[PDB]
Amino acid sequence: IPKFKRLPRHIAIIPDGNRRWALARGLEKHEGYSSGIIPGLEVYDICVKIGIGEVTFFGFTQDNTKRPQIQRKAFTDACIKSVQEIAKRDAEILVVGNTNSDIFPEELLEYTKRTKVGKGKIKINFLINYGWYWDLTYAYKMIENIASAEIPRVDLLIRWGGRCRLSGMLPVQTVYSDIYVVDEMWPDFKPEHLFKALEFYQNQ
């Protein structure tokens, strides 16, 4: 672990590339997501270590639910497991997303209010059945009243899978965010990816 001069208060993670990763290894499109769980744990461990205040994970969106059922099952199960495995660890967990839906997993409903609030420990947010449109129109003041109001400004956003876009992640919080793209697919996560992103951030 290298020594850092600047550190971002809030990191956003877009863990994209799961399907392409599976295809490139001769697996089915849906068989990459489960390999996304441990990388989530690695990012958590490294963040708690260097003392990052807040991390927001892109879980899945209402747009992602329009993908085939065998994929939706895979990334929903992968997301559920990811939250549960971070629940085990010492973290203030919040899940933001449209609960008023069959699609939202019952397992995660208990995290839609921040657990272990004000214990002076890292905050980990998950976007689960999230939509930018759903988020903004949640208001009915407004900026304070958006669904994602508890999630503050994003300083550094890191996306895996080589695509440079927000895919509708936190339009309000990301307005000024520095974006770092990793070309490697999420399941091919290396600690070097995160370190190189933190190096990019401190050079601003």
Contact set with Mg ion (CB under 5 A): 16
Q: Is 57 in the site for ligand PLM (CB under 6 A)?
A: yes
Q: Where are the alpha helices (DSSP H) in 37-112?
A: 37-50, 69-88
Partner that binds at residue 179, options Mg ion, ligand PLM, a copy of itself, none, CB closer than 5 to 8 Å by kind:
a copy of itself
Whole-number Cα distances in Å, 124 to 14, 70, 130:
14, 27, 16
CB contact burial 65-91 (16+ within 10 A = b; e otherwise): beeeeebbebbbebbbbbbeebbeeeb
Partner that binds at residue 40, options a copy of itself, ligand PLM, Mg ion, none, CB closer than 5 to 8 Å by kind:
ligand PLM
**What is the footprint of ligand PLM within residues 13-32 (CB under 6 A)?**
14-16, 18
Residue selected from 41, 172, 188, 199 as contacting a copy of itself according to rule CB under 8 A: 172
Q: Is 151 in the site for ligand PLM (CB under 6 A)?
A: no
Q: Is 185 in the site for ligand PLM (CB under 6 A)?
A: no
Q: State the Cα–Cα distance between residues 82 and 58, nearest whole angstrom.
A: 11
**What is the footprint of ligand PLM within residues 122-141 (CB under 6 A)?**
126
Whole-number Cα distances in Å, 116 to 94, 100, 106, 123, 174:
10, 24, 20, 10, 26
Q: Is 165 in the site for a copy of itself (CB under 8 A)?
A: yes
Question: Which residues are at the interface with a copy of itself (CB under 8 A)?
Answer: 19-20, 61, 63-64, 66-67, 132-133, 136-143, 163-168, 171-172, 174-181, 204
